[PDB]
Scaffold this motif. Structure first.
Motif, PDB file in Angstrom:
ATOM      1  N   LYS A 255      89.024  32.504  89.896  1.00 58.48           N
ATOM      2  CA  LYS A 255      89.344  33.942  88.434  1.00 58.48           C
ATOM      3  C   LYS A 255      90.306  33.902  88.476  1.00 58.48           C
ATOM      4  O   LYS A 255      91.286  34.200  87.087  1.00 58.48           O
ATOM      5  N   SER A 256      90.834  34.708  90.244  1.00 57.69           N
ATOM      6  CA  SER A 256      92.661  35.053  89.306  1.00 57.69           C
ATOM      7  C   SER A 256      93.583  33.709  89.317  1.00 57.69           C
ATOM      8  O   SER A 256      94.311  34.169  88.368  1.00 57.69           O
ATOM      9  N   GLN A 259      92.941  33.905  85.016  1.00 54.79           N
ATOM     10  CA  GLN A 259      93.312  34.675  84.838  1.00 54.79           C
ATOM     11  C   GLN A 259      94.966  35.031  84.445  1.00 54.79           C
ATOM     12  O   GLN A 259      95.686  35.167  83.808  1.00 54.79           O
ATOM     13  N   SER A 263      97.546  34.013  80.763  1.00 51.33           N
ATOM     14  CA  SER A 263      98.785  35.435  80.735  1.00 51.33           C
ATOM     15  C   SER A 263      99.680  34.473  80.573  1.00 51.33           C
ATOM     16  O   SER A 263     100.641  35.173  79.878  1.00 51.33           O
TER      17      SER A 263
ATOM     18  N   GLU B 220     105.463  43.161  82.179  1.00 49.45           N
ATOM     19  CA  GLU B 220     104.198  42.357  83.252  1.00 49.45           C
ATOM     20  C   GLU B 220     104.358  41.848  84.704  1.00 49.45           C
ATOM     21  O   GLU B 220     103.468  41.794  84.552  1.00 49.45           O
ATOM     22  N   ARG B 298      95.176  35.618  73.481  1.00 46.04           N
ATOM     23  CA  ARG B 298      94.534  34.848  74.603  1.00 46.04           C
ATOM     24  C   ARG B 298      93.445  35.840  74.126  1.00 46.04           C
ATOM     25  O   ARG B 298      91.888  35.761  74.989  1.00 46.04           O
ATOM     26  N   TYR B 301      89.644  33.834  76.133  1.00 43.64           N
ATOM     27  CA  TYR B 301      89.358  34.782  77.540  1.00 43.64           C
ATOM     28  C   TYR B 301      88.836  35.683  77.714  1.00 43.64           C
ATOM     29  O   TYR B 301      87.657  36.053  78.206  1.00 43.64           O
TER      30      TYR B 301
END
Ligand SMILES: CC(C)=CCC/C(C)=C/CC/C(C)=C/CONC(=O)CP(=O)(O)O
Lengths: 407, 323, 6
Positions: A255-256, A259, A263, B220, B298, B301
């Motif tokens: 999961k991480s 993500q 990004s 970020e 994104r 996602y």
């Protein structure tokens, strides 16, 4: 509609994706800013010249660049003296993607050459007479595989190769990159990639390796080179890939990880960055985005029901756009970004990334996205080994006929 | 002795003191591939190196030769290795060697070999005294040098030199709070010293992180850290956070903020919270704002997340097909 | 030019 811009990057809204430094300038922001402004010019070039944008993959140009490089290089490629197998691979793969046939004259020479790079103790060095090193070894194999002739395959001394791998294995599960060399996640991936393809994996070869790799995943969700280090696309890829081969993907917080990778795609630029808060780069089109297919496969194996059936978890259109518009050299070859010079490394991976972005495939489901002219379509590439899926199968099959060294 | 860049530099084949040796040409085979057309100097040196290597000549002159091959292609690991061999065999002064390598690193800091060499040296000498300051200087040129950072971590660790790192981290973050490497370092230090379980520490960190976000809401890195330090324990486990994040929405919004919120709701719904549905919707609404407006790059996602949340947290998720 | 991966 008529006023509608088919290109994501050119759309007026897209401009809002420019960096917001919050009026706080640091070196990081300035650099990003410079890049964004330069990229902006690229995007707007069509508008200011008063021409309708046509996204064309300069195949002919790239082919010529490749074709020649495969044979000889200038004094500029000196510092790549200890990495010749990489050149063979980078080029061969690039051609394979471009769907250019490999003359049997070429093939055989490559073979003989690589043979000259094979150490008497197993593994490959970066040039004849150099000590064997995992990176050139990975490259050598992948290269030989792209060829796939019996000759190619017979070059590899599997016994020695295995021995070699063992001589590098560490108690904590990791591997040296070569005798007296350093250790990081690349070794794991190289060892695996070759071990699996050649069918030399023994029961204890990767004892604890997975766990070692696991320890490299950090707080960012990505993977560092070695436990404790910042997450980075190259290492992340190496890690996942290695684990995928080891069928131990589960050992990670997928999961991480997911993500994290997602990004990494630059909002304004469309391409990917290697690590948070750093600049975008063509190579990552593969290193980073290549993870998506991996993740997809893994999650899906967990019966993940929310998984798309037609796309990867990144803006395929935007990646393809970036590649095409800013990573192509007019004279041929691909690159990092505008202002940077072409080189086989980038040519190899930008293409690979591109293929990935055009090709979605999860079992029976298959859906492509080919930005620009349809002639742009490439041959698909395997997300683990980054070689033609067919070559993978061909290779493994052939090697499975052989017995794991020693039995 | 005779620098490779010296105007009076002479080819090894034109060197008397090397007359006894026959150079070994590179065995590229009958019909080469990826053939590099090496410059004269290059071919000459390596031709000679090939020889000494073959003969395994463990000599001083060999030692000097290696420096040259390196200077030519510092990426040549084989050369490096042999040089280490010679250092041992020839009983060479390691500090003198340190001086050497530090110089070399300074010029080609983005190379694997150089670092690994210095590592080995430090290991042999069991002396880290020079490390930190050295590394600092490199970092002072490229604050994101991955090799340098990695080395630093290894050092601090093997020699338990933790005492002053956080201080360092602080200084770098001041210079560029957007430096992701530093954020990783900070997490590296804390994790191995006090740990994050110590509530006073945890708290302190978060305060600081939020404070940073406030100053630069679009950085970020801070966000990633913040998430990084709380996620494992469980985002829902810290109720005030949510409220506090919502407060920044006005004058401190960003797709990062929005995203975080989804992560919170995500965890809340994971640990069966109050108002199951109310949260869920707030989450999906966000997945959409992100996918459609605030973070389209994104989109795939975001669509997946919302789809996952829907897949396991809609009032119908636990309801049988027949109802 | 150099090879940044090894
Ligand atoms: C199979 C292999 C050999 C994979 C390795 C792939 C990569 C991309 C490794 C990267 C190694 C690394 C992080 C080197 C440090 O210098 N690199 C950078 O700084 C590039 P960026 O600025 O994009 O992070």
């Amino acid at each position: 509609p008529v006023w509608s811009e088919p290109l994501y990057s050119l759309r007026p809204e897209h401009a809002r994706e420019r960096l917001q430094d919050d009026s706080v300038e640091t070196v990081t922001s300035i650099e990003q800013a410079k890049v964004e402004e330069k990229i902006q010019e690229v995007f707007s070039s069509y508008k200011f010249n008063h021409l309708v944008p046509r996204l064309v993959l300069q195949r002919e140009k790239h082919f010529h660049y490749l074709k020649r490089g495969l044979r000889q290089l200038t004094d500029a490629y000196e510092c790549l003296d200890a990495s010749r197998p990489w050149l063979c691979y980078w080029i061969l793969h690039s051609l394979e993607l471009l769907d250019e046939p490999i003359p049997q004259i070429v093939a055989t020479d490559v073979c003989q050459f690589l043979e000259l790079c094979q150490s008497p103790d197993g593994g490959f060095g970066g040039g004849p007479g150099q000590y064997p090193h995992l990176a050139p070894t990975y490259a050598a194999v992948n290269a030989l595989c792209i060829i796939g002739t019996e000759e190619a395959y017979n070059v590899i001394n599997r016994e020695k190769l295995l021995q070699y791998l063992y001589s590098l294995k560490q108690p904590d599960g990791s591997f040296l990159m070569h005798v007296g060399g350093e250790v990081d996640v690349r070794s794991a991936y190289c060892a695996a990639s070759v071990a699996s393809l050649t069918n030399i994996i023994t029961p204890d070869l990767f004892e604890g390796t997975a766990e070692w790799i696991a320890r490299c995943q950090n707080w960012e969700g990505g993977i560092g080179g070695v436990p404790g280090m910042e997450a980075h696309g190259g290492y992340t890829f190496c890690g996942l890939a290695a684990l995928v081969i080891l069928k131990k993907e589960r050992s990670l917080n997928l999961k991480s990880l997911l993500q994290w990778v997602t990004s990494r795609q630059m909002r304004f630029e469309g391409g990917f960055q290697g690590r948070c808060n750093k600049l975008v780069d063509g190579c990552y089109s593969f290193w980073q985005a290549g993870l998506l297919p991996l993740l997809h496969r893994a999650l899906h194996a967990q019966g993940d029901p929310a998984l798309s059936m037609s796309h990867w978890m990144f803006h395929q259109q935007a990646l393809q756009e970036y590649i095409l518009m800013c990573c192509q050299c007019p004279a041929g070859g691909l690159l990092d970004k505008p202002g940077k010079s072409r080189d086989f490394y980038h040519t190899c991976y930008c293409l690979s990334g591109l293929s990935i972005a055009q090709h979605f495939g999860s079992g029976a489901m298959l859906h492509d996205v080919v930005m620009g002219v349809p002639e742009n379509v490439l041959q698909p590439t395997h997300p683990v080994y980054n070689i033609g899926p067919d070559k993978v199968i061909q290779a493994t099959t052939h090697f499975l006929q052989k017995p794991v060294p020693g039995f | 002795f005779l620098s490779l860049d010296s105007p009076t530099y002479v080819l090894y084949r034109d060197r008397a003191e090397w007359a006894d040796i026959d150079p070994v040409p590179q065995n590229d085979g009958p019909s080469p591939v990826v053939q590099i057309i090496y410059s004269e100097k290059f071919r000459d040196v390596y031709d000679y190196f090939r020889a000494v290597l073959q003969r395994d000549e463990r000599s001083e002159r060999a030692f000097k030769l290696t420096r040259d091959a390196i200077e030519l292609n510092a990426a040549n690991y084989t050369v490096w290795h042999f040089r280490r061999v010679l250092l041992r065999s020839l009983q060479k002064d390691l500090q003198e060697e340190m001086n050497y390598i530090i110089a070399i690193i300074e010029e080609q800091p983005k190379n694997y070999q150089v670092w690994h060499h210095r590592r080995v040296l430090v290991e042999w000498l069991k002396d880290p005294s020079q490390e930190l300051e050295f590394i600092a200087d490199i970092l002072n040129q490229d604050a994101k040098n991955y090799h340098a950072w990695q080395h630093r971590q290894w050092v601090i660790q093997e020699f338990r030199l933790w005492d002053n790192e956080l201080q360092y981290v602080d200084q770098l973050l001041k210079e560029d709070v957007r430096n992701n490497s530093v954020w990783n370092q900070r997490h590296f230090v804390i994790s191995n010293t006090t740990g994050y379980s110590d509530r006073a520490v945890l708290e302190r960190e978060v305060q600081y992180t939020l404070e940073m976000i406030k100053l630069v809401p679009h950085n970020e890195s801070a966000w990633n850290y913040l998430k990084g330090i709380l996620q494992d324990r469980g985002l829902s486990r810290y109720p005030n956070l949510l409220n506090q994040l919502l407060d920044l929405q006005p004058s401190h919004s960003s797709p990062y903020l929005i995203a975080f919120l989804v992560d919170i709701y995500e965890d809340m719904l994971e640990n069966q919270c109050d108002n199951k549905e109310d949260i869920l919707n707030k989450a999906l609404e966000l997945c959409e704002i992100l996918a459609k407006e605030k973070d389209t790059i994104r989109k795939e996602y975001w669509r997946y997340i919302g789809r996952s949340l829907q897949s396991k947290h809609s009032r119908e998720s636990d309801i049988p097909a027949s109802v | 030019t150099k090879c940044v991966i090894m």
